[PDB]
Design an enzyme around this catalytic site. Structure first.
Site, mmCIF file in Angstrom:
data_model
loop_
_atom_site.group_PDB
_atom_site.id
_atom_site.type_symbol
_atom_site.label_atom_id
_atom_site.label_comp_id
_atom_site.label_asym_id
_atom_site.label_seq_id
_atom_site.Cartn_x
_atom_site.Cartn_y
_atom_site.Cartn_z
ATOM 1 N N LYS A 56 -54.673 -43.434 28.553
ATOM 2 C CA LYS A 56 -55.180 -44.211 29.472
ATOM 3 C C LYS A 56 -54.602 -45.497 29.467
ATOM 4 O O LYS A 56 -54.297 -46.049 28.428
ATOM 5 C CB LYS A 56 -56.795 -44.586 28.958
ATOM 6 C CG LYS A 56 -57.714 -44.916 30.219
ATOM 7 C CD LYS A 56 -59.101 -45.114 29.626
ATOM 8 C CE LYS A 56 -59.929 -43.955 29.026
ATOM 9 N NZ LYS A 56 -61.009 -44.100 28.326
ATOM 10 N N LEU A 109 -55.607 -45.560 35.079
ATOM 11 C CA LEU A 109 -54.973 -44.402 35.597
ATOM 12 C C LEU A 109 -55.071 -43.548 34.337
ATOM 13 O O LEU A 109 -54.800 -44.318 33.096
ATOM 14 C CB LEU A 109 -53.726 -44.364 36.199
ATOM 15 C CG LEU A 109 -53.371 -44.627 37.711
ATOM 16 C CD1 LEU A 109 -52.312 -45.717 37.610
ATOM 17 C CD2 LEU A 109 -53.136 -43.661 38.368
ATOM 18 N N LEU A 164 -53.473 -37.289 35.603
ATOM 19 C CA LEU A 164 -54.883 -36.402 35.495
ATOM 20 C C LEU A 164 -56.071 -36.749 36.393
ATOM 21 O O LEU A 164 -57.033 -36.080 36.811
ATOM 22 C CB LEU A 164 -55.417 -36.690 33.912
ATOM 23 C CG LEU A 164 -54.944 -35.570 33.096
ATOM 24 C CD1 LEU A 164 -55.346 -35.866 31.498
ATOM 25 C CD2 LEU A 164 -55.367 -34.078 32.955
ATOM 26 N N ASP A 216 -72.199 -45.003 31.363
ATOM 27 C CA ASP A 216 -71.765 -44.355 32.552
ATOM 28 C C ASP A 216 -71.789 -42.970 32.544
ATOM 29 O O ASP A 216 -70.738 -42.132 32.591
ATOM 30 C CB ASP A 216 -70.267 -44.808 32.881
ATOM 31 C CG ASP A 216 -69.783 -44.428 34.383
ATOM 32 O OD1 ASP A 216 -70.584 -44.441 35.319
ATOM 33 O OD2 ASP A 216 -68.413 -44.217 34.601
ATOM 34 N N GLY A 240 -59.870 -43.233 36.237
ATOM 35 C CA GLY A 240 -60.987 -43.810 35.317
ATOM 36 C C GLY A 240 -61.666 -44.931 36.107
ATOM 37 O O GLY A 240 -61.015 -45.401 37.142
HETATM 38 C C1 OXW Z 1 -60.010 -35.140 39.253
HETATM 39 N N1 OXW Z 1 -60.101 -34.499 37.954
HETATM 40 C C2 OXW Z 1 -59.135 -33.213 37.862
HETATM 41 C C3 OXW Z 1 -59.104 -32.405 36.456
HETATM 42 C C4 OXW Z 1 -59.115 -33.679 35.351
HETATM 43 N N2 OXW Z 1 -58.994 -33.131 34.014
HETATM 44 C C5 OXW Z 1 -58.964 -33.975 32.823
HETATM 45 C C6 OXW Z 1 -58.695 -33.246 31.552
HETATM 46 N N3 OXW Z 1 -58.488 -33.676 30.534
HETATM 47 C C7 OXW Z 1 -58.988 -34.745 29.812
HETATM 48 N N4 OXW Z 1 -58.822 -34.959 28.411
HETATM 49 C C8 OXW Z 1 -59.363 -36.034 27.906
HETATM 50 C C9 OXW Z 1 -59.424 -37.125 28.512
HETATM 51 N N5 OXW Z 1 -59.903 -38.467 28.172
HETATM 52 N N6 OXW Z 1 -60.046 -39.037 29.048
HETATM 53 N N7 OXW Z 1 -59.825 -38.535 30.412
HETATM 54 C C10 OXW Z 1 -60.099 -38.724 31.691
HETATM 55 C C11 OXW Z 1 -59.002 -38.087 32.820
HETATM 56 C C12 OXW Z 1 -59.404 -38.296 34.162
HETATM 57 C C13 OXW Z 1 -60.342 -39.274 34.675
HETATM 58 F F1 OXW Z 1 -60.408 -39.643 35.660
HETATM 59 C C14 OXW Z 1 -60.969 -39.999 33.593
HETATM 60 C C15 OXW Z 1 -61.091 -39.642 32.013
HETATM 61 C C16 OXW Z 1 -61.743 -40.613 31.469
HETATM 62 N N8 OXW Z 1 -62.428 -41.265 30.860
HETATM 63 C C17 OXW Z 1 -59.580 -37.039 29.727
HETATM 64 N N9 OXW Z 1 -59.001 -35.996 30.509
HETATM 65 C C18 OXW Z 1 -58.274 -32.019 32.119
HETATM 66 N N10 OXW Z 1 -58.504 -31.926 33.577
HETATM 67 C C19 OXW Z 1 -60.412 -34.622 35.464
HETATM 68 C C20 OXW Z 1 -60.200 -35.258 36.903
#
Ligand code: OXW
EC number: 2.7.11.24
Length: 282
Positions: free
Chosen positions: A35, A19, A12, A123, A15
């Site tokens: 995570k 990853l 996804l 953050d 962080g």
């Molecule tokens: C590059 N871009 C493309 C779309 C993407 N994306 C993420 C979701 N869903 C989603 N749902 C619950 C989550 N909990 N943590 N987390 C994270 C995901 C990525 C990240 F880097 C850090 C965190 C943190 N904390 C979550 N993401 C749908 N699309 C975001 C990154």
């Protein structure tokens, strides 16, 4: 393919710790975000686990399980899958004022909650705010949540308050309120409010738009940057109204009450929710 429960592991993003993967729970046919965390990291993970485990609010991303060696209760944090993040939403342009206002209300509800639990977000930025676009739900990401009491070049400085630029280690509830105001302004314009390359350019950008009304604050700034400090800092060269030209007086007035130089004039999450501009979600 770690465990029998979590299938179809697909990345996804990244962080500030590890990853993030997207996977389908086999128990209930619904998607999760996991995570993976790879010492000083062992102490830092222990604190993060204890906090996020006891928090349950509608505007805080839900943490389901804490796992280790392939589904055993490195560490794995299983949490709810959100459709997207705010950074992704705003890359497509600014939001309608009604949507920016609704997300700001949810952001403030999530902050009022964690602040009440003596937890802050170290953050707060659009990439850490998750959105379910159909429901128009905003949830605050769990990474960064801490008790009030390497890859440095990759940490975002654009949402940092003037106090945090001057005292880089001291974190307070007020610093989250500054970041919330920056995020609101960004939701309305689609652009970063203060986009400084380094701490010096950042402070210069804020000083061009935010009044300095206390002599204590002006005396502190005179020691750090004497050249860009005038005798009357009460009247900025480019006020907030000029930085948000299309957006409404109501919204700019509300934002002027959050983007105050001093944390002692700044609205708390609770005060901002009581403000007539936010109180409309009865
Ligand atoms: C590059 N871009 C493309 C779309 C993407 N994306 C993420 C979701 N869903 C989603 N749902 C619950 C989550 N909990 N943590 N987390 C994270 C995901 C990525 C990240 F880097 C850090 C965190 C943190 N904390 C979550 N993401 C749908 N699309 C975001 C990154």
């Amino acid at each position: 393919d770690l465990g029998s429960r979590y299938m179809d592991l697909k990345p996804l993003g990244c962080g500030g710790n590890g990853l993030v993967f997207s996977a389908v729970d086999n128990d209930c046919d619904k998607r999760v975000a996991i995570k993976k965390i790879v010492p000083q990291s062992v102490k830092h993970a222990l604190r993060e686990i204890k906090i996020i485990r006891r928090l349950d609010h509608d505007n805080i991303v839900k943490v389901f399980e804490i796992l280790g060696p392939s589904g055993s209760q490195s560490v794995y944090i299983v949490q709810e899958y959100m459709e997207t993040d705010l950074a992704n939403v705003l890359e497509q342009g600014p939001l309608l004022e009604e949507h920016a206002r609704l997300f700001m209300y949810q952001l403030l509800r999530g902050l009022k909650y964690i602040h009440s639990a003596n937890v802050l977000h170290r953050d707060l930025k659009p990439a850490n705010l998750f959105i379910n676009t159909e429901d128009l739900v905003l949830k605050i990401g769990d990474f960064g949540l801490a008790r009030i009491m390497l890859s440095e070049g990759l940490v975002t400085k654009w949402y940092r308050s003037p106090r945090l630029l001057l005292s880089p280690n001291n974190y307070t509830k007020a610093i989250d309120m500054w970041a919330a105001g920056c995020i609101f302004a960004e939701m309305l314009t689609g652009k970063t409010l203060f986009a400084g390359a380094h701490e010096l350019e950042q402070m210069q950008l804020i000083l061009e738009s935010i009044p300095v009304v206390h002599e204590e604050d002006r005396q502190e700034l005179l020691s750090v940057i004497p050249v860009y400090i005038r005798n009357d800092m009460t009247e900025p060269h480019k006020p907030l109204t000029q930085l948000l030209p299309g957006i409404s007086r109501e919204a700019v007035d509300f934002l002027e009450q959050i983007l105050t130089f001093s944390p002692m004039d700044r609205l708390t999450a609770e005060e901002a929710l009581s403000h007539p501009y936010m109180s409309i979600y009865s």
